[PDB]
Amino acid sequence: IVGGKVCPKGECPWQVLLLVNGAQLCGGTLINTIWVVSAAHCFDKIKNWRNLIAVLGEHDLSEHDGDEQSRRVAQVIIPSTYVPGTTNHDIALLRLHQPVVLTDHVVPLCLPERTFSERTLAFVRFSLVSGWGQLLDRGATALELMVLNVPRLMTQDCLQQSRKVGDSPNITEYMFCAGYSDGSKDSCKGDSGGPHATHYRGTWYLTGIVSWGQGCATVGHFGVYTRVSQYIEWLQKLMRSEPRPGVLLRAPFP
């Protein structure tokens, strides 16, 4: 997170820390005691699929306390349409091997119905993005969970307000931009898979996933997030399904 502030311990209860071989890897969002939504590119170079750990109730990566809960990632489901190294369909549904305990420090974020999210939440100006990513472009990662409030933009405005880049990726209907183009605030590489939560009338909902962007907080560029509303059905059908043999699973999309 670039240009943000520490998320007071307990105020980002759905933030998930993803580890591979005990090393920091990505962020995530708990949407129920057994499932976690994250980004697909987070698994582009994974090899030890049995070494994926998800931690909840985390805050300070340098001090252990009783709010922390660890769980092996039993399954990683990525859209069959996602292409490693690319940007479209950057989403992943993780099945924890064992449900986490809901507490004052571990609570899931609501996964909204498609239309509610497109017709209402999509027009709530600000939403929170968070994670333990870089505090600066090419900089080091954070020790304490950082949070940032960013404004959402419709794609037409994003393109119009962005500077063209050498054959840069297209912003699809499966994405949306949020952030600032003045080079001051934005999410970053290590925040990948993290939540883009929208507050609406007393309840927070999952509207986006930290996915990609031109560097981090680059002048004339916005952060890009996965438009989760486009995957509601996909997520719901999968969460009611039986676990597959291996860890990695490519599920069709639509």
Partner: protein
Amino acid sequence: ANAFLEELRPGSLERECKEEQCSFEEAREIFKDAERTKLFWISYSDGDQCASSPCQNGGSCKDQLQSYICFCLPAFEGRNCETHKDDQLICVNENGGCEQYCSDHTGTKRSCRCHEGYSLLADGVSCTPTVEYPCGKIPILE
């Protein structure tokens, strides 16, 4: 207006443009000066656009140059107060006042719903937690 021989009488704004309708010329005969006459004629001949009674639903029309302005009653809006603020109970309008989910319905009124872990209260628009840790709520702040 001009009646037989009245023109022998000097010009009079009152008798000529107030108590009667006066032509541009009669007006120019009172003011004499061109600009003064024009400054007067712009409004005098503009005609009251509030005559159509365009402002609906008990609104109030305020005349202007080649136009009007409608002041509406609280429950109304629109150029001519034609829009009923109470006829917008559709979902795309502030989520139809629903706290969480909203579902349109042709003819009838929209209905409100809630996310799992919540229940619809009797107001038919609010949702309340039905578990200890409903999604989207922050414990150390509730």
